Symmetry: D2
């Protein structure tokens, strides 16, 4: 028949795990033969997941740090990369608020359908691919890599280890470069800066990270796996079964049967160390933007795992100027990078950028009608020396690219779009 | 064996068409008994489509005009209402560019799946409903009508009269208030400011408008029907069958078999007059923002149909200051409204606000990291004086509303969200 | 200013609760005031949800029993109603196997996206509405109610009370007549006839049944709520916090933190008694089709709630003729109805009818090609005596209905479908 | 900065076109450079579309003929392969009737959203992959190739050449092996055996076929392209612009402006010869199942293109025994295969199998309840002799495969599914 997509043998997988530096301090408690046993007789190639994960991993080592902003539409990711950024962050909060498959607006509590983040990963890749296609026919080489790696939110996995597995597999099918997984109970998941957070036992989250790595291995892509702990603020945990969690149990219980637990940096450091063999990066959620609390967490973890890369949420859920002055804000990311926070991200940047700009425009328009919009259009013209291109919305969205398709099919077509447009005539 | 949703009698519908001022100069070439024959034995109520269409009809007569901005996400629509706007425009261009069900970025050429605009109508209504629910528990009466009427883009119907019918039916199921339909060939559809436009015969567009009205009648809701002509710039038409079109046919053909046709305001005036018995509002696409041309179109149509309301596209596809001075720009919508342009809209407002604001934030972030974001957050704090609420993003997307559900189910729940949040603590 | 969809006042809600016999023995632990506070200023009418819930309720009291087959496509439900059944069963197992929004084939473990069953509800209603519409234009009175009530699977709620609330809300929006809810941990959910099941505490399932009733009340519809218990086979429970479950707790614990518990009919009886004030019907999963065990459960429950209706899963996961002779199989559902099992259903009827018929067809087709298909067509022709209509597939699917739309829009249309069809000329 | 998915060079593409026998008689009116120009800087690999197309092309040359049945769910394709079939047919008609993204039941008139068939391609592939995964862990080698090639319906492209391009690209991404395209007007598209069909000019369908090859070239996969002509029965055409269609134009016109045209075998032969350079297989719809008419068509076409493979629709829209005796029926497909009809398919097999099997079961269940279902279950047990496996529905849908995933993550998990199941205990 055909040999397309034949899976590798267990031995070839094993040699890769033994010799490739990518897997240096990666623990897999399953075997290579286990991976092959799950792959069927055909392995689909996942081009964008492979390329993204590779590029992300190199970047995490070659750059002083990799930073990103949350993107919830395709055009958002295109502008992030046009503006120079080298990675995209796919916030689950933002998907909950304004981009999930239920169509509803939700708080950040794993309420939306579990395939919602994968769909947005696919959307962002499609949008980047379109900018890449448009840049090629225009000879625009100002952007080196349109296909920036995407790091996406797996939340608490929407259930057990098998829901984790399927989420990761879907994320990879959509072309994700990395994914993060937090040690909360899925059925009570919260934004790390909301209350009512409930942890799961340390070993249960190790199962989740093992499942996330298994799905990437079965899919044969080196996806970046990020472990997040919410132990800094959570005062509840589902069980005391795990001996590593028992030191923090207080004995008090809730009507639901949850266990009260002592929160803070101490559970966070211990969970980071338990997750380290199972995590390419480690992220601890914090209550404030504090370089000193971050140094304290960082140093402890590298004390046992010196090569362990970390990740930091520069969260809009912090009132930044209530806590830091302008000098500290301006150095914040650079300082974190020195401590080993190699991936830093503003989770809700898209939500705030979108909501503020539309309120600003709409309130102007409610008072001044067209004068309000022309101010925006003039700001857009001005931004073109900075590299902005979306003022010409027709080309920005592919009109010239689909013209090229139409003339490739029929060079004499009288129904192409850009010729005779007001964009060609006024821009 | 229930009375729920029993359809009306023919006589009942007929009497409504005869007596309700809503149908003053509305021609239906089909009968009431034709409508009943298509309704089965159960007629689903469409609450939001009914309320939206009735509210929209009133505002078109009570206000001096109705204006709106394009919205491509739910949060966008929420901010427009929060800022005082009383209607939402749902642009098909923006759906093609950044919000359609294929996942791809597309030029405005009817490339996306035909149920994409219905899905966004449903999304916007869900979002406005969430805001309405939150305001109610917060005792916030600052907005009188959260459920602003949505006017949505039907494009060229994505095919024949039955595709038109199904699109209108889906728009109504999602809660649309009004829909607009243009006289282009669906297979060659363009943004009215792109080239390569192909008109369809006058009678074929009357068929489209009749099908949109029938679908609203069968759905038993008074949807506002908007007729759009693209004849100002189109120099192609599919056929010379219609005697009303023949005066502008030149006899030149293209290789695809299209007919060349003399473009300009004269064909728009003739098509407008032909569409007026079938259209609640009439919309002529133009190539520049020109108050004198608008007046010429308006007076010509009103000479025959004095009560005929018009709609105008304040298009971002115009380079506005290259054509008008700030004085005229400032008075543009007010002047148009006096000529009878009672619905005016900026089609791509959402695209440009989203793309510009993200490029701006990202560009600063690339050079100054957290300092660029804190600037945005401080702008958001400032805008609270004008009624902005999204700085508190948790309550904005319904964290307090879902807490209320949670404590309604279990008042002693230990896992509610706002108590202990950094938002409760820092905002 | 509009009165469309204005919410009721708490007093109206209270009076309906106190006076409607629908709510005779129904406990609500929240107030009518609470419900109103969640309704915003507009309540969408849910026509099919209201009509189907009312029809379902009346049928449960007017017929000896209501039976149903699992349906996973719209055409399936149409054929069930055409063949005389009076309710549709919407199996979550079948959705996981062959009709969920991930696009993947899954075992029955709550792996698919949580809006999947709602989408199939909406689909089934659309298909029944089409059959209804066709029947009207055909003058076909052979089916008195095409819109048969749909009873759909809400599984273990896909998370907490809030995930339950959103699933019930989406089911109602899609037009469901009733939904069922089982006392398993969502993250380890199983088909009742699979091993490895984990119970939640009795109170937590009461919270679920309360959440489901609350969403029905906030959506202003009398949805039938079914409580399912999995305690006949489950030997694991998440916690020993509820004193009603402690008598069955052994005290040993698993690595996951689960508690071993003594399974069988006695925990089912106790749980059923605890659920009775919050469930319109009660369902205990069993390991075999056994009338004697069903009698035991019915007698025990009814000894305290004599008017409590029960549901029974006539499961294809039983090897029927391994456990009963043809005489017992023939009387099975009649005997169950005499014991109060008023809703009875074959969950996987659609999966087995679909899978066997296609294997049988394809096997014959591989062997004798067209001869195998002609055998099917001839059986279809022979079934017309019994009322089968789908041999004429064009009309079955609405070609004549859309011809009626087409000729309503344009009575002179030269592109209608059934005239000149091979169906008109060969059938 | 990665070599993953680096596009081939134009010279590499040219060499394959010049030297690979797959492209022997394939005309491309565009260039290899035009293909690279559209590829961006990264080309995603489409494993299933590549493997499927390669297997399909091989099977069309190795086997006496390749026959298929229409499949509208994943389980349907699984049973077709289990029973020995080597290809799957994906019918646009069936998607309209029971499996499209609108949720509605439609007649076969391109009413559904244009990404519906790609979604079903992706679904079928997912379902075959799961059967493949299950077979591997079961040690089941009874099926040589679970990933049977999929031939899917592109209808009339849902618009112009760019709609055609996007549908082919979406079909490829979902993993299709071949796609067929008909010379009908998209806005008036019909099932070949409905009336009211409108042809488009010969050259316009060459543009569609060229557009379909271009998309496969840009996606770097050798998708099989089938050309369908509806000219046997269609009496209307949009235009007389093409001199190849003028021999049949009568001069009369309809009120819509369509041209009446003389239908039959003669325009079909002229159109097949025009399409042959742009089609891997050629299909003419017929009004009856007639071996002599089929013979005449093949001989006339092969008279000029001796190697041109043909495709034939064994349509359930024929009343088979009304036209043919059992002997002709039994030999029909073999006879066609000797004429060059290498792909033969029963389009609506799934619709009729699904509809008849559910009516039959439900009618029996209405009369005799469980006796009727046990009759089916016993037939399923009996079919196991023939290779049927779905009586064990738990493993059929992957309960064993997900158990293997669960015990790869945690070998001592206490929540696996098949151990303790009734399927293990009773089957
Ligand atoms: Mg998140
Ligand atoms: Mg590590
Ligand atoms: Mg538009
Ligand atoms: Mg009018
Ligand atoms: Mg179930
Ligand atoms: Mg009760
Ligand atoms: Mg078809």
């Amino acid at each position: 028949m055909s040999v397309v997509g034949t899976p590798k043998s267990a031995e070839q997988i094993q040699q890769e795990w033994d010799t490739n530096p990518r897997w240096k301090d990666v623990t897999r408690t399953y075997s290579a033969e286990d991976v092959v046993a799950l792959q069927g007789s055909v392995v689909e190639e996942h081009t964008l997941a492979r390329r993204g994960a590779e590029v992300l991993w190199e970047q995490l080592h070659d750059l002083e740090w990799v930073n990103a902003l949350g993107a919830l539409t395709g055009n958002m990711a295109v502008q992030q990369v046009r503006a120079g950024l080298k990675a995209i962050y796919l916030s689950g909060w933002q998907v909950a608020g304004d981009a999930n498959l239920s169509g509803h607006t939700y708080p950040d509590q794993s309420l939306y359908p579990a395939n919602s983040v994968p769909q947005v990963v696919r959307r962002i890749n499609n949008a980047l691919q379109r900018a890449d296609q448009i840049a090629k026919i225009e000879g625009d080489t100002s952007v080196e890599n349109w296909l920036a790696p995407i790091v996406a939110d797996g939340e608490a996995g929407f259930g057990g280890a098998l829901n984790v597995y399927e989420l990761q597999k879907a994320l990879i099918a959509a072309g994700v470069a990395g994914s993060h997984w937090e040690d909360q109970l899925a059925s009570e998941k919260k934004c790390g800066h909301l209350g009512g957070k409930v942890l799961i036992p340390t070993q249960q989250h190790i199962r989740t990270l093992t499942s996330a790595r298994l799905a990437a291995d079965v899919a044969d892509v080196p996806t970046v796996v990020i472990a997040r702990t919410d132990a800094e603020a959570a005062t509840l945990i589902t069980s005391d079964v795990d001996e590593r969690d028992q030191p923090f149990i207080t004995g008090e219980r809730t009507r639901e049967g949850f266990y009260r637990t002592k929160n803070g940096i101490e559970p966070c450091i211990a969970r980071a160390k338990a997750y380290a063999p199972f995590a390419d990066l480690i992220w601890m959620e914090t209550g404030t933007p504090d370089l000193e609390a971050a140094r304290q967490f960082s140093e402890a973890v590298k004390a046992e795992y010196p090569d362990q890369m970390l990740a930091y949420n520069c969260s809009p859920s912090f009132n930044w100027k209530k806590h830091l002055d302008d000098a500290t804000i301006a150095k914040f990311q650079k300082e974190l990078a020195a401590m080993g926070f190699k991936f830093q991200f503003i989770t809700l940047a898209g939500f705030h950028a979108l909501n503020y700009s539309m309120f600003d425009l709409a309130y102007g328009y409610a008072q001044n009608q067209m004068s309000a919009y022309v101010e925006l259009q003039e700001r857009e013209f001005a931004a073109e020396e900075r590299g902005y291109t979306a003022t010409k919305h027709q080309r920005e969205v592919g009109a010239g690219y689909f013209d090229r398709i139409a003339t490739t099919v029929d060079p004499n077509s009288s129904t192409t779009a850009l010729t005779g447009s007001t964009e060609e005539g006024q821009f």
